[PDB]
RNA sequence: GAGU
DNA sequence: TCCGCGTCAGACTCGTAGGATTATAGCATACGTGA
DNA sequence: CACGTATGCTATAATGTGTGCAGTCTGACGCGG
């Protein structure tokens, strides 16, 4: 039953015997009276077995009395029924067949081996045309087709001494004689002579085949069917319905039509029929058996009366209705239970409520097998039946079971794994359960009619397991970033705001209280309001240097409702984190504070206190939504009377033809913007401060307590974009097309929308919807795809003992830190002695996780950078270490071994993506884009810095930058970078590089919808392939006549002027080109497509002005839609469409010859002097200008990186800071957390295989792929042994090609293309010995990881003795 | 030990490890009615495990001491 | 180029030569004196004339290729029969066997039950019967109706029409959502879930044990004619192969260990509890 | 749809030239569909069904 | 819980006599996805320990 | 059709 | 080497209802098992 | 023998399919001319 390998080879006529119990010869399936199995038919008894355990059909032997008996009278066995499940059979074919995987399943497997062209096996398989087998005439060669006519020249000529054959006899005969060792050693020959890179991959992959071949053992014969297996009765059920009707298995119908067919053939053959005849039955055949495997593969799919296709063979196997999806990887699962989930604000976070009905009849056997130790029930039916009976003992037994007995709850969709969580069950009479609410943001339940699943762990193991590893008290933490996901939300944030927040003096302004209880002892007395400003008394505890806590006692200027809050915290953390004003913010690290000072059964108790108490006095607050809690500003409609004249101005200078429409369109879309921003401004200012009502002396100012601002500010719910459609303009909705409505919505909720504003509305607001129904399962097959490459890793060691690691760098986007060297570095074990700037002193050891402590140390220490040990560098085979990995960031702590790290990395990459699919587009309505960059302006005075920049001074007298990627920093007194920017093409810097400038002064500043082309030289322009009507186009105005040039590019172009590039080239006073300083460049920008130029022919220039303008059209509203199909491109290691070029060795570079225009790159570096070159595109325009010390990957143009190009010149490092970077560029505009180890774990994942090019001193040789791990154990050995060592280059693989690379098949079939994989592992003869996650879950085995590591290592070490 | 495992994790260490020694031990009360260390206060053979653990009574090296302890004696009683 | 196996058989048969009334005789007067040549020219001149046939007998049970297959055989049965010396032509004879030929094949493999042609013609004379009876009664023939018009028993009537329920694919999903089908409702009956294996387990090592508390000579004389601890399960004269050899003392002795094991079921709480089950 | 004759064009059918391709499509209530259509050489082909 | 269909009365059994012990074998499952693949004439074969 |  | 045709993928649980259709002549002599 | 199931034979001349639908889905990645 326990075996330890699985094998899948080709399998032979003989093989399909071997497992047959009988041959089928007849379609009867039974009697139409007695409902028996027919005679050699297809649910024969005789050969399949007894329908009825130890029965034979006739009923001469009953019973276990008649044991392995063979009944004489009705020849069957008398055995258990089971076997009409396990005994396959078989049908002997009176024409052999082609098995349709090894002929249409591509690679062509039959055609590749033989060499012969698919469409010529066919045109001999459906008896087209004879092909020649073996002509002993030289005059006739191997494999040669030949027709009708053609067999019937050489037939009298030649004949005899040329054998050709027709059909499925030839093509088999062709491969039986085939010899594969001679013909590897010919065509390994061949490959000598003048390998060209595509004959030499088509050479290569039939010599891996005839290798393969033969060490498989298989033949190749036998991917022609002469045996033909028939499945098992059961698997392919005929079963009587109630109403007298049967239902039967497509798989029936199907073998009905074979063996009809086959036996017709017999009869044509005994009758000896004309050839035409023979061959259209055989042509029959072929159809049926193609059916009968795999239906709709080679042409229609043979239909049922239905219309629909009958569902084959391979239909069982493949995609999500197949075995492996359906049934293998996830089940129905007993002991389930699922119904309505409603609140339990009185749970503590480790219970939820459950229904009693529901826990009665989940705990069954349970309440049985402690009925009979109590002896109450004599028997299990008398159990039953008390049960049933519901009878008053029972509930009480059923109550003793449910104690510390944990249960399982889950919410879909399972995104991560905090989706199901375990509680100590707390019955309850009625039939919801209950969920405890601070959960409710991990499960993304609201209790709109949401339900959930209920599953009871079985097992001592199961229990355990649920208690220690899945309760919701011991996971707080996201695994995805070190972050609290247990949180205060809604009331809970609004309650604590409320006793929190103060007001001016109220009830017992500067009063003086004994302790926080003398507070609530006033409060509820009703002598103080929450919000009073009295000073109180509280003694604070603060840790100290060692373990003893330090008590400190002192005089707070706080209020009665922080006083009584007090109360819940725990003794340990300061009286000042409660002493400002609470909102949602300061509750998340209040909560990560008591996390980190006291622990996890403090933080616990803590989180349900805070609960408590926030509901308790959101409800006392008495909060409530009126319309009059909805403030419109007195000065909405002077606002909009003038932004409605401004657009009168502008329509009036449309009319008169002067602005063109594009430009009307762009200035009122920017007055009414302007506009929104004005009166939602004025909303806020009379909102937020509006109690200017106060008292004492005389009037004060202080912050509004208007329900919805109170509901807003403290982060319960609502924000100020929501308060703007709520009080004040609605604003400017969006197309479906994405382009923006010109006349916006004037009016808001509380005024109420006319039909036009609301029909507007709607197109947004259906557009958000429909991406949540649609877009959910693009994110949700990256989760798949992501999940599948990262199965097996799993931490498999302590400690690999390597020195490797990346070095990270603070992270500076936009201008706010958004990733601090701490954030990133944090939990994360540090490789190398990482001391201070003095390099004289050691500041930090090896192998130390970097803890809260050490990271703060570094802020004072001032760290640049630090090399950090990574999942990449890892050197453990077969998983990482937990050292390389560091902190679970669940947990709090380093990771333990054993923990199944990548699945938990694919979750976390995963599930963000998927869930942002389904809530800015529910919601997602109003269109609120943002892209004004104009002018940079700085803040912290300092010296401009830039970097890769190349300005030149114009006309005007300002540094006009002419370079694309353009960064600048700002430097401050000691020198160190606090403030980054990006400075665009065309930009106008007011000061240069070194020089100093002022805080709140524009260093930088240019035109947001433009992108320039700007001269290095003055002169005069010239036209140069700018012929109108082929290139560019006309079009002028009147009087005078201005006219402006419009580029055409491939789109609108004829195909006249396709290989014509149209370039504005520099000219000086005579008519000659004007050399680019220091440099054999004639003057000449290249203008792209759809480029506006409004200079003509013949007009002077300095160097600085702007030649043309290309249009930027990005009013996009990015979201998520967009952004996941980056991150899918850069998993999946797609080269971008136009990629930079790169410098592939380090030395000096020589320009060269051209091809027409087209760049050769002659180089020649200092030690490898033999040259090196590479063509280049004509108009493809290079940053660098030769005559260089270039590195290895020295960008040479402006474009993409292409990852594979990055890995080959820079290495492992370099590749994987290029994903980890642009894939958190997308997350972390969507202000998204993850931790870059999780893109880290899947980076390795792709980075699995390496091309060996060169031999090694086992039977690798040229250009075969294999896992890395592999090759670096045989160097291990080859280092003991010397020999021939192996020089390989690892390689980057794409997520599914990485997935389909793993050595188990069974985990690349149960994937995807299953049709295809199990063709190449039949073929290849291939043994999977399961190490793998996804084979031992299809097995239904235990996990090789999490608890099963134990178990799993002690298999693993009693394989490896013996 | 019933709430938070937090202390009885901190006393073996390996999550995946307390949950085998405490099933095993667990499995000894369940079957052999071998008798508890600390006082059961009316718990569950899992809870009283834990505790046992997280008092540092119960440990996967001491489990397989009496595993030992109780075969070779019983080897001796045959012999 | 044509892959069509329809296509390309069609093009075959096209290109053999039609034949005329003396042709017919002079080559058939060879192929029944046994001439290979003969045979085949008449088979596959007449090829078409199959085709032609097999196109009037098409969407109904099997395919045009699969008609046709068939409709060759009755050719082949036809050019074996023919009879050169009668003046009758051959196009006519030919004619008979093919239809006949494809119709008795439509009636064996169209049906996943194999109806034999007996059931199969009595169901049709049926069917054509309640044609006529629909075409004056308005409204669809009951079986009473249809059995009135033929005089014959109405349960012989429904019983064949019974036969005519047509079977259901277990793989044809419900409900417009491909999601689930037939296989995914219908439960396994004949192999009971735990629960009852679980209570037969119950039953059957109660009796056991409860021979243990009765008598050892009731014990030895009960189970071992049930068969509960014996091998084979005696009858009451058969219990005298063991050593019992008596057929007055073995029946008295049976229900003796009957009626002690009635009152130790009346105690532990069963009898009339456990008599509804 | 309702029937009757639909000109159309995909924007950009080949993403590498982007050249607009017109087509033409007559839809009957019941027969073969008769399409007319452009290629990248400006050449009208006519396809059925 | 689901095919092993020894391993669910077994452990039904043991559920009612208190020991939660874990009995497991092979899902029903797996073992007719050998017999599908057998059927298309793939050699899919057990290698034991 | 129910919650994403 | 580039157009063109082919094949392959496209979240997770929950609900509801059961199922449709056609038509194969008519009669004379065999083939097989129990009695 | 009988009851159910099968095999058989017809003699005007007849001699190359269609048939009922599909509705166009899409972005990607290989594979023969
Ligand atoms: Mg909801
Ligand atoms: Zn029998």
């Known amino acids: 039953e326990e075996f330890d390998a699985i094998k899948i080879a080709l399998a032979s006529p003989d093989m399909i015997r071997s497992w047959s119990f009988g041959e089928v010869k007849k379609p009867e399936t039974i009697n139409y009276r007695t409902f028996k199995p027919e005679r050699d038919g297809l649910f024969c008894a005789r050969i399949f077995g007894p329908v009825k355990d130890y029965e034979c059909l006739c009923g001469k032997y009953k019973r276990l009395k008649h044991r392995g008996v063979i009944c004489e009278k009705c020849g069957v066995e008398v055995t258990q029924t089971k076997v009409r499940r396990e005994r396959m059979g078989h049908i002997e074919l009176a024409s052999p067949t082609a098995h349709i995987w090894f002929l249409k399943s591509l690679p062509s497997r039959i055609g590749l081996l033989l060499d012969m062209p698919l469409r010529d096996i066919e045109r001999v398989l459906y008896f087209e045309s004879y092909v020649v087998i073996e002509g002993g005439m030289t005059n006739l060669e191997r494999q040669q087709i030949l027709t009708e006519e053609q067999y019937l020249d050489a037939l009298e000529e030649f004949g005899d001494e040329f054998d050709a054959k027709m059909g499925a006899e030839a093509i088999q005969a062709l491969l039986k004689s085939m010899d594969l060792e001679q013909e590897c050693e010919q065509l390994r020959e061949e490959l000598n002579e003048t390998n060209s890179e595509t004959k030499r991959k088509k050479l290569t992959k039939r010599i891996k085949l005839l290798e393969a071949f033969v060490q498989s053992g298989n033949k190749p014969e036998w991917m022609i069917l002469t045996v033909l297996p028939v499945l098992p009765p059961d698997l392919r059920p005929l079963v009587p319905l109630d109403g007298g009707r049967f239902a039967t298995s497509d798989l029936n119908d199907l073998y009905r039509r074979v063996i009809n067919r086959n036996n017709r053939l017999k009869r044509l053959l005994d009758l000896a029929a004309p050839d035409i005849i023979v061959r259209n039955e055989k042509r029959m055949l072929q159809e049926a058996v193609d059916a009968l495997l795999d239906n709709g593969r080679r042409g229609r799919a043979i239909t049922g009366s239905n219309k629909r296709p009958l569902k084959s063979l391979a239909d069982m196997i493949k995609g999500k209705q197949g075995r492996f999806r359906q049934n293998l990887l996830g089940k129905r699962v007993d002991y389930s239970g699922r119904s309505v989930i409603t609140v339990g604000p009185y749970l503590r976070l480790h219970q939820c409520g459950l229904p009693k009905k529901m826990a009665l009849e989940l705990f069954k056997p349970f309440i049985y097998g402690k009925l009979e130790l109590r002896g109450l029930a004599t028997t299990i039916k008398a159990a039953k039946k008390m049960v049933e009976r519901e009878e008053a003992v029972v509930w009480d037994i059923l109550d003793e079971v449910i104690r510390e007995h944990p249960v399982l709850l889950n919410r879909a969709p399972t995104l991560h794994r905090l989706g199901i969580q375990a509680f100590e069950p707390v019955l309850i009479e009625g039939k919801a359960i209950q969920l405890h609410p601070l959960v409710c943001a991990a499960y993304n339940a609201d209790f709109d009619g949401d339900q959930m699943a209920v599953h009871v762990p079985l097992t001592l193991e199961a229990q355990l397991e649920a208690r220690a590893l899945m309760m919701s008290t011991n996971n707080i933490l996201s695994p995805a970033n070190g972050e609290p996901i247990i949180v205060p939300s809604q009331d809970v944030v609004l309650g604590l705001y409320y006793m929190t927040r103060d007001c001016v003096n109220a009830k017992g302004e500067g009063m003086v209280l004994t302790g926080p209880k003398e507070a609530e002892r006033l409060y509820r007395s009703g002598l103080a309001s929450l919000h009073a400003r009295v000073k109180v008394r509280i003694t604070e505890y603060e840790k100290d240097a060692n373990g003893e806590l330090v008590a400190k006692t002192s005089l707070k200027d706080t209020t009665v409702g922080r006083a009584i809050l007090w109360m819940i915290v725990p003794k340990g953390l300061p009286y000042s984190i409660v002493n400002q004003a609470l909102g949602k913010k300061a509750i998340s690290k209040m909560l990560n504070t008591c996390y980190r000072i006291l622990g996890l059964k403090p933080t616990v108790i803590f989180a349900d206190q805070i609960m408590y108490t926030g509901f308790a006095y959101a409800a006392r607050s008495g909060a409530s939504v009126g319309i009059d809690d909805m403030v419109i500003p007195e000065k909405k409609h002077e606002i909009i009377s003038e932004a409605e004249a401004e657009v009168a101005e502008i329509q009036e200078q449309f009319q008169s033809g002067l602005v063109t429409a594009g430009e009307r369109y762009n200035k009122v879309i920017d007055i009414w913007a302007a506009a929104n921003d004005r009166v939602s401004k004025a909303m806020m200012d009379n909102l937020q401060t509006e109690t200017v009502i106060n008292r004492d002396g005389q009037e004060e100012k202080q912050v509004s307590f208007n329900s919805i601002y109170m509901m807003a500010d403290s982060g319960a719910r609502g924000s100020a974009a929501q308060i703007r459609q709520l009080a004040g303009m609605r604003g400017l909705m969006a197309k479906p097309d994405g382009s923006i409505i010109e006349t916006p919505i004037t009016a808001n909720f509380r005024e109420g929308l006319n039909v036009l504003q609301y029909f507007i509305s709607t197109h947004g607001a259906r557009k958000g919807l429909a991406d949540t129904a649609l877009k959910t399962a693009n994110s949700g097959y990256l989760t798949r795809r992501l999940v599948d490459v990262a199965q097996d890793l799993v931490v498999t060691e302590d400690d690999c003992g390597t020195h490797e690691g990346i070095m990270m760098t603070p992270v500076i986007e936009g201008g706010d830190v958004k990733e601090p060297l701490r954030d990133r570095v944090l939990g994360r074990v540090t490789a190398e002695d990482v001391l201070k700037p003095g390099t004289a002193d050691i500041l930090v050891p090896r192998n130390t996780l970097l803890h809260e402590q050490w990271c703060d140390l570094l802020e004072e220490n001032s760290v640049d950078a630090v090399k950090v040990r990574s999942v990449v560098s890892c050197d453990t085979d077969f998983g990482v270490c937990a050292h390389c990995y560091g902190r679970d960031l669940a947990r709090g702590h380093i990771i333990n071994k054993g923990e199944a790290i990548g699945v938990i990395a694919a979750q976390s990459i995963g599930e963000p993506g998927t869930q942002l699919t389904m809530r800015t587009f529910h919601i997602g309505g109003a269109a609120s884009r943002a892209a004004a960059e104009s002018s940079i302006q700085v803040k912290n005075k300092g010296s401009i810095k830039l970097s890769n920049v190349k300005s030149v001074v114009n006309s005007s007298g300002k540094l006009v930058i002419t370079s694309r990627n353009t960064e600048l920093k700002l430097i401050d007194e000691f020198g160190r970078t606090k403030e980054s920017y990006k400075v665009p093409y065309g930009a106008v810097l007011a000061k240069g590089d070194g020089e100093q400038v002022a805080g709140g002064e524009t260093v930088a500043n240019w035109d947001p919808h433009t992108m320039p082309v700007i001269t290095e030289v003055s002169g005069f322009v010239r036209f140069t392939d700018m012929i109108d009507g082929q290139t560019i186009t006309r079009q002028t105005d009147e009087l005078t006549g201005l006219s402006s040039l419009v580029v055409l590019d491939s789109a609108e172009r004829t195909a006249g002027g396709k290989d014509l590039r149209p370039a504005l080239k520099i000219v000086d006073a005579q008519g000659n080109d004007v050399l680019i300083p220091g440099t054999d460049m004639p003057a000449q920008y290249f203008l792209p497509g759809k480029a506006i130029v409004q200079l003509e022919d013949g007009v002077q220039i300095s160097s600085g002005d702007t030649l043309a303008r290309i249009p930027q059209e990005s009013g996009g509203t990015k979201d998520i839609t967009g952004g996941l199909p980056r991150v899918a491109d850069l998993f999946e290691a797609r080269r971008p469409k136009e990629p930079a070029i790169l410098a592939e060795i380090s030395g000096i570079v020589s320009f060269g010859k051209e091809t027409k225009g087209k760049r050769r790159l002659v180089i020649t570096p200092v030690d490898g002097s033999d040259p090196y070159e590479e063509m280049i595109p004509k108009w493809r325009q290079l940053n660098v200008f030769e005559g260089e010390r270039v590195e290895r990957g020295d960008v040479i143009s402006d474009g993409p990186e292409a990852p594979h190009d990055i890995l080959r010149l820079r290495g492992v490092h370099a590749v994987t800071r290029y994903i980890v970077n642009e894939v958190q560029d997308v997350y972390r505009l969507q202000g998204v957390k993850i931790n870059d180890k999780h893109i880290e774990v899947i980076v390795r994942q792709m980075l699995r295989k390496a091309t060996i090019v060169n031999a090694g001193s086992s039977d690798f040789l040229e250009g075969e792929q294999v896992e890395y791990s592999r090759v670096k154990i045989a160097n291990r050995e080859l280092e003991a042994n010397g020999k021939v060592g192996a020089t390989y280059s690892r390689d980057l693989l794409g997520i599914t090609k990485a997935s389909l690379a793993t050595e188990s098949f069974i985990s690349a079939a149960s994937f995807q293309e299953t049709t295809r994989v199990l063709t190449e592992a039949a073929v290849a003869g291939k043994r999977d010995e399961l190490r793998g996650l996804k084979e031992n879950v299809i097995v239904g085995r235990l996990i090789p990881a999490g608890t099963g590591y134990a178990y799993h290592q002690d298999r693993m070490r009693r394989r490896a003795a013996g | 030990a019933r709430v938070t495992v937090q202390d009885a994790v901190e006393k073996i260490g390996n999550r995946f490890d307390l949950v085998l020694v405490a099933a095993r031990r667990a499995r000894q009360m369940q079957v052999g009615g071998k008798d508890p260390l600390v006082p059961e206060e009316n718990d569950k053979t899992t809870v009283i495990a834990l505790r046992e653990i997280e008092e540092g009574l119960i440990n996967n090296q001491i489990l397989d001491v009496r595993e030992r302890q109780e075969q070779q004696e019983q080897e001796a009683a045959e012999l | 180029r044509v892959l069509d196996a329809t296509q390309l058989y069609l093009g075959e048969i096209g290109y053999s030569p039609l034949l005329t009334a003396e042709e017919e005789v002079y080559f058939a007067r060879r192929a029944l004196r046994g001439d290979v040549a003969s045979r085949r020219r008449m088979i596959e001149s007449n090829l078409r004339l199959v085709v032609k046939i097999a196109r009037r007998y098409g969407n109904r049970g099997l395919a045009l290729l699969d008609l046709i297959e068939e409709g060759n055989l009755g050719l082949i049965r036809a050019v074996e029969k023919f009879d050169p010396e009668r003046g009758f032509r051959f196009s006519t004879y030919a004619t008979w066997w093919i239809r006949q030929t494809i119709e008795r094949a439509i009636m064996n493999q169209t049906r996943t039950i194999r109806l034999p042609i007996h059931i199969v013609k009595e169901l049709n004379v049926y069917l054509r019967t309640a044609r006529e009876l629909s075409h004056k009664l308005d409204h669809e023939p009951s079986a009473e109706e249809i059995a009135e018009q033929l005089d014959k028993p109405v349960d012989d009537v429904s019983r064949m029409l019974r036969l005519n329920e047509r079977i259901t694919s277990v793989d044809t999903p419900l409900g417009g959502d491909s999601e689930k089908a037939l296989l995914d409702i219908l439960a396994d009956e004949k192999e009971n879930g735990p629960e009852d294996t679980t209570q037969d387990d119950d039953m059957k090592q109660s009796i056991v044990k409860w021979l243990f508390e009765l008598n050892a000579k009731q014990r030895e004389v009960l189970a071992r004619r049930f068969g509960l601890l014996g091998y084979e399960a005696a009858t009451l004269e058969d219990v005298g192969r063991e050593i019992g050899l008596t057929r007055e003392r073995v029946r008295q002795i049976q229900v003796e260990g009957l009626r002690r094991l009635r009152e130790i079921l009346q105690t532990q709480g069963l009898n009339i509890e456990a008599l509804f089950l | 749809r309702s029937p009757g004759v639909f000109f159309d064009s995909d924007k950009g059918k080949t993403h590498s030239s982007g050249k607009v391709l017109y087509n033409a499509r007559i839809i009957p209530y019941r027969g073969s569909w008769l399409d007319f259509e452009f290629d990248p050489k400006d050449n009208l082909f006519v396809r059925i069904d | ?49």
Do not use: A, C, W
């Not at chain 5, 095919?3 to 006599?17: H, S």
């Not at chain 5, 499952?29 to 057998?38: A, C």
């Open chain 5, 1 to 49: 819980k689901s095919d092993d269909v020894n391993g669910r009365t077994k452990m039904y059994k043991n559920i009612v006599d208190g020991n939660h012990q874990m009995e497991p074998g092979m899902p029903e499952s797996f073992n007719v996805l050998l017999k599908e693949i057998r059927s298309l004439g793939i050699n899919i074969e057990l290698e034991d320990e």
